[PDB]
Design a protein around this ligand. Structure first.
Ligand SMILES: CCCCCCCCCCCCCCCCCC(=O)OC[C@H](COP(=O)(O)O[C@@H]1[C@H](O)[C@H](O)[C@@H](O)[C@H](O)[C@H]1O)OC(=O)CCCCCCCCCCCCCCCCC
Ligand SMILES: CCCCCCCC/C=C/CCCCCCCC(=O)O[C@@H](COC(=O)CCCCCCCCCCCCCCC)COP(=O)([O-])OCC[N+](C)(C)C
Ligand SMILES: CCCCCCCC/C=C\CCCCCCCC(=O)O[C@@H](COC(=O)CCCCCCCCCCCCCCC)COP(=O)([O-])OCC[N+](C)(C)C
Ligand SMILES: CCCCCCCC/C=C\CCCCCCCC(=O)O[C@@H](COC(=O)CCCCCCCCCCCCCCC)COP(=O)([O-])OCC[N+](C)(C)C
Ligand SMILES: CCCCCCCC/C=C\CCCCCCCC(=O)O[C@@H](COC(=O)CCCCCCCCCCCCCCC)COP(=O)([O-])OCC[N+](C)(C)C
Ligand SMILES: CCCCCCCC/C=C\CCCCCCCC(=O)O[C@@H](COC(=O)CCCCCCCCCCCCCCC)COP(=O)([O-])OCC[N+](C)(C)C
Ligand SMILES: CCCCCCCC/C=C\CCCCCCCC(=O)O[C@@H](COC(=O)CCCCCCCCCCCCCCC)COP(=O)([O-])OCC[N+](C)(C)C
Ligand SMILES: CCCCCCCC/C=C\CCCCCCCC(=O)O[C@@H](COC(=O)CCCCCCCCCCCCCCC)COP(=O)([O-])OCC[N+](C)(C)C
Ligand SMILES: CCCCCCCC/C=C\CCCCCCCC(=O)O[C@@H](COC(=O)CCCCCCCCCCCCCCC)COP(=O)([O-])OCC[N+](C)(C)C
Ligand code: NA
Ligand code: NA
Lengths: 630, 82
């Protein structure tokens, strides 16, 4: 009834005490269950908390006083919305959110649910109707809301408690929800990184024997790998540099200290799921990320990852990479030198008549075995690393060009045995790509690799904008010139071709006297010359110059990711040739479990020195019984 | 170096002039300018009537104004226009 909720909104204490006398004469059972608002499930308690003020409504205790005399309180407090757009939002969700920490005490006391799952549509991921996703558990609402005194209350509250494992419809626990809510801002990063500690302290204080970060969701992604994948760099920086300094919350410390003599101290980062976990390692989830994951290129500046990939590189991958380079250098030499000495006389296939022709077909065999190689290796990139239609033609500009090289290189095999001379058109595009694809292997070299990152950005930022506009003018004046010519340069090729020469400094301003109006012709070329040679090629240099200023460190961070993707494909390739990925870290004891056992975490050393932390608060230091692992 | 953001702001104005000539051109082809905003109640007049101002939504999020001083908030009886 509208009159009932009217008195709830305007905190009318006497009217709700008058209706107290009304309903208690009746049975109340269906009576109030029919009075709640149609197709929304808005009972008197839910609506009382939306229309409260400054931490009170004066009806919220009263309606619970009515519900303890008149039975069926449990249906009232746990009454959630009915529509699929506010579904499951109990009175307790509104309690946490609107900051009245004293209110939510009464609800859990009065049989309110704390395992309430609010998956409507305002609590899912849709930019239409931009809902706020908090994790689908009130424990996670308080966590995402800067309510830490409340989350502490949710786990020491009376008889009914909140289950810290906050598995929901999507499977995201509270830590997952805290990754999904981040924004990589300073206020939010400063917040969420803190909250993990207290959730983790409490998870280790109130429910030991369950380390909370190994837990996953419906899609199967830890909060570590959910921060790696969703682009959360400050979150990821915390979880990797996590250094808890207190007993019985110390096994969860991620950055240990294996010793500290003076200023020098050997940090002992753990490689738990940075590399070689059964799914979704941080390096994979960053390296094998899609395209629009924010901060993707900065997420390897995070320690230990910058110094772990440089460890795998200097130790494992630098020797296999420079071998793969050499084998591709010689593949080009063998393929070049097999194409330079092709048979000009006749139609293919050709014969091994001379002695040299046996060596030539050999280089042709060895050429095709590498074409099917980069073919299959470009297939299984689309079966191992499944892309989407946007990430085919973006973020994977290499696996296409080595695969594209093979298309020409296998069409070359089709058109050789299909009895045509068109094998040359394909064999020659395989060479230009093939040598142009040597610029892949700059990514094992810092100064050449960054240079080749500064090549790709120009081709996509500056040539791409340039050459498009350039072809507007070119075809714009070309048509304008061949329109004027009468007659031989009366073609659109031989006039686009001659006007492209002004670009490369080979423009004759008198390439045709077969015009009919000279001033038209000369006005029309000098317009092309000024707008293209003097303006637009020099404008290009300017934009490159502004680009290079922008992409200076943004290209070094694309470089370390190019090298990173190389370090991981190298692991997957040599999984049985020599060994596994080598595990890139020493299994070392860091302390003791809370269950009273050794830990033995695969850890990566980082010798660090600091000339200001003179005190050297001992804290963690593990082999302080030793001094430097001797 | 000078005209980096001073050219993006000339660009949004080039696009702006295009958005408005497009309105004036198609004033009868399909519709008016489409009015680009939902007629919504924002409160009440000082003369004691509804307001119904043509308003444009902007979903905004701020991770420092934790208190959330209520002040204006209009459909606080609701939660998110449902
Ligand atoms: C009938 C056929 C018709 C054609 C259309 C069919 C499709 C065309 C092919 C698709 C592709 C079209 C490409 C157009 C030119 C641009 C190339 C370019 O930006 O590449 C950079 C690439 C980088 O590596 P990666 O991708 O691994 O790194 C990426 C990348 O950095 C990303 O930003 C990061 O997230 C992260 O680092 C990582 O995700 O570097 C190399 O791949 C090595 C160097 C490669 C050479 C670079 C120079 C450009 C040469 C182009 C011309 C080829 C040679 C002449 C041929 C003549 C005609 C046959
Ligand atoms: C990076 C990718 C490559 C780019 C290459 C760029 C290079 C430049 C553009 C290359 C592509 C387009 C070239 C024209 C198409 C072939 C027809 C032609 O040349 O002449 C046609 C004539 O008529 C004309 O020349 C005018 C008609 C143009 C219609 C096509 C639109 C092209 C759009 C894009 C244009 C740019 C707009 C801006 C684009 C953003 C007929 O063919 P013909 O044989 O020449 O005529 C002989 C006929 N006769 C014997 C009876 C007398
Ligand atoms: C290159 C330096 C850089 C360093 C890298 C070194 C790279 C390797 C170096 C050299 C390898 C080749 C040596 C043998 C051929 C020499 C004799 C010969 O035929 O000479 C002829 C040229 O050569 C040809 O006509 C053969 C075609 C080229 C061979 C391509 C490599 C084959 C794969 C196997 C290679 C090993 C891989 C497998 C190993 C396990 C002389 O020319 P012509 O006779 O005047 O005219 C051509 C003939 N025709 C007219 C009849 C058409
Ligand atoms: C054929 C019989 C053997 C005789 C050949 C004779 C040699 C003549 C050479 C080349 C001709 C050989 C065939 C061509 C193969 C195509 C090229 C290729 O595979 O490149 C791969 C090499 O990575 C490999 O794993 C190569 C496989 C081993 C080659 C063994 C022969 C090398 C001998 C000589 C060793 C000398 C050592 C000296 C040390 C001082 C490319 O690496 P990738 O990891 O795929 O990364 C790129 C692909 N991506 C961009 C898509 C990611
Ligand atoms: C991608 C997913 C996997 C692909 C499939 C997996 C395998 C891929 C690898 C290999 C399989 C082969 C693929 C290509 C086709 C072979 C050539 C051919 O059919 O030629 C035909 C003609 O051809 C010509 O007339 C021109 C030939 C030269 C073209 C040069 C560019 C090569 C492009 C390379 C492709 C780059 C494509 C770029 C992709 C974005 C021959 O057929 P025909 O009926 O006898 O025609 C005769 C006509 N004629 C007498 C007038 C001459
Ligand atoms: C090892 C390769 C054997 C290849 C043998 C074949 C011949 C030689 C081939 C190429 C020359 C390679 C020499 C490498 C050693 C130089 C010193 C150095 O380490 O780097 C230095 C110079 O860096 C360079 O010289 C890199 C140049 C290669 C770029 C590849 C693109 C085109 C290749 C086309 C090739 C045509 C092939 C056709 C003819 C055969 C720079 O130092 P850095 O490394 O940047 O510093 C640390 C980097 N880090 C942070 C990653 C740790
Ligand atoms: C005959 C007709 C053709 C004539 C010749 C054609 C010549 C070919 C050339 C240009 C064609 C015109 C497109 C100009 C694009 C401007 C540059 C750009 O967007 O670069 C981006 C592409 O980033 C990617 O990831 C996509 C890579 C492919 C190239 C983009 C253009 C092709 C797709 C579109 C459709 C093409 C339509 C083609 C015609 C149907 C990357 O650079 P950026 O975004 O500047 O980076 C700054 C970062 N910021 C944005 C955050 C500030
Ligand atoms: C940038 C904004 C875009 C503007 C677009 C529009 C611009 C278009 C501009 C002008 C349009 C008209 C020019 C062509 C005339 C038509 C042909 C004609 O009758 O020619 C006559 C000749 O005449 C001459 O020889 C003298 C030409 C005088 C104009 C020279 C400067 C114009 C460019 C100023 C640029 C400033 C731009 C603004 C910046 C300050 C007679 O015919 P004929 O057969 O040629 O006679 C023999 C000729 N012969 C002796 C040479 C052999
Ligand atoms: C933002 C948009 C881009 C700009 C678009 C607009 C740009 C428009 C561009 C150019 C416009 C100006 C040139 C017009 C073309 C010549 C037509 C003509 O009359 O030819 C006659 C010139 O007769 C003379 O007396 C010429 C004297 C001045 C020098 C000629 C120009 C130099 C070209 C370089 C200028 C570089 C500087 C460029 C600055 C413009 C030829 O007569 P003739 O039959 O051969 O008789 C021979 C003997 N006689 C010459 C003694 C008579
Ligand atoms: Na020149
Ligand atoms: Na020149």
């Amino acid at each position: 009834r509208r009159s009932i909720f009217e008195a709830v909104a305007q905190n009318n204490c006497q009217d709700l005490e008058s209706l107290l006398l009304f309903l208690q004469k009746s049975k109340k059972h269906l009576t109030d269950n029919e009075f709640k608002d149609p197709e929304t499930g808005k009972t008197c308690l839910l609506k009382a908390m939306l229309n409260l003020h400054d931490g009170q409504n004066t009806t919220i205790p009263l309606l619970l006083e009515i519900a303890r005399q008149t039975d069926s309180l449990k249906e009232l407090v746990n009454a959630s919305y009915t529509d699929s757009y506010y579904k499951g939002q109990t009175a307790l969700h509104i309690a946490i959110e609107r900051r009245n920490m004293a209110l939510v005490t009464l609800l859990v006391e009065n049989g309110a649910d704390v395992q309430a799952a609010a998956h409507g549509d305002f609590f899912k991921k849709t930019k239409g109707r931009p809902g706020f996703y908090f994790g689908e558990l009130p424990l996670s609402l308080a966590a995402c809301t800067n309510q830490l005194g409340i989350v502490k209350f949710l786990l020491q509250n009376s008889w009914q408690t909140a289950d810290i494992s906050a598995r929901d419809s999507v499977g995201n626990t509270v830590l997952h929800a805290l990754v999904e809510v981040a924004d990589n801002t300073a206020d939010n990063t400063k917040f969420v990184t803190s909250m993990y500690n207290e959730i983790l302290m409490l998870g280790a204080k109130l429910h030991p024997t369950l380390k909370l970060e190994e837990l996953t969701n419906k899609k199967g992604m830890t909060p570590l790998a959910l921060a790696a994948g969703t682009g959360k760099i400050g979150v990821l920086a915390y979880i990797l540099q996590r250094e808890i300094q207190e007993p019985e919350c110390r096994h969860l410390s991620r950055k240990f200290t294996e010793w500290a003599y003076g200023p020098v101290h050997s940090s002992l980062y753990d490689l738990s799921c940075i590399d070689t976990c059964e799914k979704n390692s941080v390096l994979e989830v960053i390296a094998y990320s899609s395209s629009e994951t924010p901060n993707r290129h900065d997420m390897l500046l995070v320690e230990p990852l910058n110094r772990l990939l440089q460890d795998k590189w200097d130790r494992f991958v630098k020797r296999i990479f420079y071998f793969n380079f050499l084998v591709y250098c010689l593949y080009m030499i063998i393929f070049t030198m097999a194409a330079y000495y092709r048979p000009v006389d006749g139609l293919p296939p050709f014969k091994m008549e001379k002695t040299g022709d046996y060596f030539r077909v050999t280089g042709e065999i060895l050429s095709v075995l590498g074409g099917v190689y980069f073919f299959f290796r470009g297939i299984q990139y689309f079966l191992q690393r499944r892309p989407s239609m946007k990430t085919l033609f973006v973020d994977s500009y290499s696996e296409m060009l080595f695969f594209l090289q093979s298309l020409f290189m296998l069409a070359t095999v089709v058109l050789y045995f299909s009895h045509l001379k068109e094998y040359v058109a394909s064999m020659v595009f395989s060479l230009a790509l093939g040598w142009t694809n040597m610029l892949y292997y700059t990514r094992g070299f810092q100064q050449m690799g960054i240079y080749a990152v500064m090549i790709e950005k120009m081709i996509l930022r500056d040539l791409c904008r340039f050459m498009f506009v350039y072809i507007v003018f070119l075809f714009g004046f070309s048509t304008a010139v061949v329109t004027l010519i009468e007659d031989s340069y009366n073609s659109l090729y031989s006039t686009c071709l001659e006007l492209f020469k002004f670009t490369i400094g080979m423009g004759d301003l008198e390439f045709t006297e077969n015009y009919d109006f000279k001033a038209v012709f000369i006005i029309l070329l000098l317009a092309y010359v000024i707008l293209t040679y003097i303006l637009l090629l020099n404008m290009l240099i300017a934009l490159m110059g502004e680009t290079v200023n922008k992409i200076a460190q943004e290209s070094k961070n694309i470089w370390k990711l190019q090298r990173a993707i190389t370090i991981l494909d190298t692991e997957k390739s040599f999984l049985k040739c020599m060994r596994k990925a080598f595990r890139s870290g020493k299994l070392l004891q860091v302390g003791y479990t809370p269950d009273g056992k050794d830990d033995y975490r695969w850890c990566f050393r980082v010798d660090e020195v600091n000339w200001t932390t003179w005190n050297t608060n001992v804290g963690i230091i593990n082999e302080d019984p030793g001094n430097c692992e001797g």
